[PDB]
Design a protein around this ligand. Structure first.
Ligand SMILES: NC(=O)CC[C@H](N)C(=O)O
Length: 230
């Protein structure tokens, strides 16, 4: 894989722990950051990051600004119409979080009349929007998970949908969230470029990921955030 730019710009979410997030000491970090940086180093590519939000990253890549996005991004057939993806590097399901002070939601049937949050442009938004009439709830959209999570904590929304590993990590950090429903299978995460653009970034992502899966660096990066409980 041969670089064709002196630096490539990578857009990402501004709050999606453990994949990308500002830690308490105000440093951007996470699995996506460490993994893509390590892949680029393995392959001799140079990156610069813009932590701008999920939909903002989609928009930047689609407008020919960011060269790619690494943002806990689900691989879907619909997105393949406008993005090229690299090899899958993680897996996720969708789940609901409620406040753990509230026993009123025990199933999708108890969400009738409630207000649910989701982040702009995400798989969670797509799922909630598509099921809103079926289950009788309303949807409120957010551009930063910090604002969405704050709204669940302050009671201005009754529940939210987000990716399962992100909600699990939030609970591990101490968020007072409950998880009343069975997660919805939602495939894999991938690195993405605009369809037909920057093919060498996909080549080097795939080469680097295969190398780091095989040499143990991938697992070390996952462990850094998501330790074994055994
Ligand atoms: N950063 C995110 O919120 C991504 C959520 C979800 N995996 C998606 O691709 O829509």
């Amino acid at each position: 894989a041969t670089p064709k730019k002196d630096v490539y710009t990578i857009a990402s979410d501004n709050s999606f722990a453990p994949f990308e997030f500002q830690n308490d000491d105000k440093q951007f970090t996470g699995i996506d950051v460490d993994l893509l940086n390590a892949i680029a180093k393995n392959q001799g590519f140079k990156l610069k990051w813009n932590f701008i939000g999920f939909q903002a990253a989609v928009d930047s890549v689609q407008s020919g600004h960011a060269d790619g996005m690494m943002s806990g991004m689900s691989i879907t057939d619909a997105r393949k119409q406008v993005f090229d993806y690299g090899s899958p590097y993680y897996s996720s399901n969708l789940t609901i979080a409620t406040s753990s002070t509230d026993d009123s939601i025990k199933s999708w049937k108890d969400l009738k009349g409630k207000t649910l949050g989701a982040k702009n442009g995400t798989a969670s938004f797509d799922y909630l929007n598509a099921h809103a009439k079926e289950y009788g709830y309303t949807v409120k959209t957010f551009t930063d998970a910090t604002t969405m999570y704050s709204s669940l904590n302050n009671g201005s929304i009754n529940a939210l949908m987000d990716d399962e590993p992100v909600i699990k990590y939030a609970i591990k950090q101490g968020q007072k969230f409950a998880t009343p429903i069975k997660p919805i299978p939602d495939g894999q995460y991938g690195f993405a470029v605009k369809k037909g653009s920057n093919p060498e970034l996909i080549e080097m992502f795939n080469n680097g990921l295969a190398n780091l899966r095989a040499n143990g660096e991938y697992d070390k990066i996952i462990d850094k955030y998501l330790e074994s409980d055994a």
